[model samples]
Target: SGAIYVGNYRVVNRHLATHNDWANLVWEDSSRDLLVSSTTAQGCDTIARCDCQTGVYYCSSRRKHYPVSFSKPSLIFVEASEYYPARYQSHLMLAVGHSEPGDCGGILRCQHGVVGIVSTGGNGLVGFADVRDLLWLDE
Candidate 1:
């Protein structure tokens, strides 16, 4: 019976993607989550996401739309609290937060990018959640 542990949870909002109403599978290949109904079709989320301007949507489905297959959710910076290990005393704030920086010329990637990713690694704490769903035409 253990949970509720908030650490590094102050990255502030971050999710503004523009390149097709955002759904980063590293850039499409199976993320065709569309939802329109005649007027708002042709890669739309109310009106134009891909913006090919090739209107007409009404297919099995387009100058008049009628698409479907998506309800929501399509994947997902700044902090401070006196910053640096915050208030101390959480095992001395995780051994002083593992230093290892200052224009890293020393080196320490281990297997690089948390491969064997384990705990006690960031026991200092970590949390994240950002989704802004962006859109800006003319592609």
Candidate 2:
């Protein structure tokens, strides 16, 4: 019901790039720095195509199911890929009854989708209804 980890994070810096760049996010939270970079240890293409043409936004509740349409926007802070550093390991859970960061729940977060959530409780409170609007920073 939580995350691989959580901490107070501040924007370290950001930039725009070509190829698979969705106005990427990078952060440093105390002990580590996490970012959505397109390169790797040896720099092979490790980017996921976040195509907006077929993109959509939705989540359920701790009940796991579609859009929290009636609420304000939200920050989609689910865990970024932990695959880059393949051997990395740890633990984080939002615990069923816990709601410190409500709506994300402990696991399998949902608002307009899957299973359940206790929170989508962060920035982008007015999160985009259209993925293109959210993806294309130039707009």
Candidate 3:
């Protein structure tokens, strides 16, 4: 429940190609950076696709089944610059939780969709580079 390895996967047709003219032709919606496990890694079963995304506006409780210290991630809620401000500008968003060191890249799932990924965590909070933010930037 602590840590596990997950293989990398490249999305098919993620980028565009030009036969000759650089003008765009096909406009396909790019897929999200969805992740799956080969086995039970950090409480996720094998061959399971990640859920969708959502906007965390307030201090809402989300269930995280990953490993923690003596305590577990039950109904804890994490917020961004509003409630829990980021310590540095490097963080796209800030959140309060029990996420410890080396917990970056951990999935932050809330409700029925996974919201964001852990970027850095320490002290009484953690930082996340939201999935939605990257998706929009990549567009």
Candidate 4:
């Protein structure tokens, strides 16, 4: 018997679109050049863009949650130029969020295979997810 092999790769980027539930995971192709987006109650959203040559991730979104005290944390990854000083081994970006008594959030960077929680408004225990490809890159 021979085993079957799938070559195409799929990567999903998820974010909080509302205070009620989590946003749907946006699927992207890691093989060829592709652009991915998500549709939520708010409207059509741009999740991220994948670079076929370098395998870099770029994402952007408008701040939806508000009231300063009744808003959820929003996380986004930024894309850097190839020549730009490698903030991290892989890629780096600014994680923008409100940081107050109830509004606690800030920027951070992801390097290697770990995400560093730079600021949490002294709340401690900042949370983040590791970004990775679901399939081989050389395929």
**Best model number under TM-score:** 3
lDDT of 1 by residue, 1-139 (tens): 0011112111111122233334221222112111111112233213122312111212110122221221122231122222222221110101112211121111111111100000111333211111112222112
* Per-model CA lDDT versus the true structure: 0.18, 0.24, 0.34, 0.24
Cα lDDT tens digits, model 2, 1-139, are 2222112211111111223323333322211222232222232211122321111222333343333332222222344333223222111112212122323322232222212113323343312221111121111
Q: Total clashing residue pairs per candidate? A: 10, 35, 0, 1
lDDT over C-alpha atoms for residue 60 of model 2: 32
Cα lDDT, model 1, residue 50 = 31
Superposed Cα RMSD, model 3: 13.5
Cα lDDT of model 3 by residue, 1-139, tens digit: 1111222211111122224212322222212212222222233212213333332322223334442221121223333432234233221455555565345555554443444555445677655443433232222
| Per-prediction TM-score to the true structure, in the order listed | 0.14, 0.21, 0.35, 0.21
Runs in model 1 lying further than 4 Å from the true structure: 1-57, 60-69, 75-132
Q: List the residue pairs that clash in candidate 1.
A: 15-132, 38-65, 55-63, 56-62, 56-63, 56-64, 57-62, 57-63, 57-64, 57-65
RMSD of each: 22.0, 14.3, 13.5, 16.2
After superposing candidate 3 on the true structure, give the runs of residues whose Cα lies further than 4 Å from its correct spot: 1-91, 136-139
